[PDB]
Structure formats: structure tokens, C-alpha cells
Design a binder for this molecule. Structure first.
Ligand SMILES: [Mg+2]
Length: 72
């Protein structure tokens, strides 16, 4: 359920289902650590939505950067 609920959060935050489906479980875990999932616990979305989206984008930025240094 935990991973499942992370993937559902990513959808609820407007990530396209098409791109979520291509995340590996380890990437899901990296993008949506348990502290971020927990943010959504008593529900969205106020602009809790924008808050969490910002947190996940930060993590995705981290991931991307790491892909880019490795190569170059
Ligand atoms: Mg965990």
C-alpha cells in the first residue's frame, strides 16, 4: 500500500499517469519520501498541493542533477 499511496499522491498532485508509470519503485521512494506522503495524510489540498508539489520537484531536481554529473 505505501508505494501504491505514493503513486496515487503523485497523480493527485497532477503528475501524468503516463510518467508515473515509468518511475521505478526506488525513484518513487526518492521523489516521495515518507515525510512527504505524510503531508497529504489528513488530505489535500488547500495549497498543501502546491507545497508538496514544490517538495517533490526539489527531489526530482536532485535526481536529475545526479544523472547529469555522472555522465559529464
Ligand atoms: Mg519507507
Amino acid at each position: 500500500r505505501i508505494r501504491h499511496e505514493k503513486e496515487k499522491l503523485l497523480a493527485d498532485l497532477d503528475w501524468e499517469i503516463g510518467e508515473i508509470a515509468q518511475y521505478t519503485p526506488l525513484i518513487v521512494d526518492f521523489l516521495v519520501p515518507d515525510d512527504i506522503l505524510a503531508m497529504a495524510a489528513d488530505g489535500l489540498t488547500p495549497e498543501l498541493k502546491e507545497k508538496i508539489q514544490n517538495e517533490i520537484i526539489e527531489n526530482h531536481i536532485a535526481l536529475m542533477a545526479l544523472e547529469e554529473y555522472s555522465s559529464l
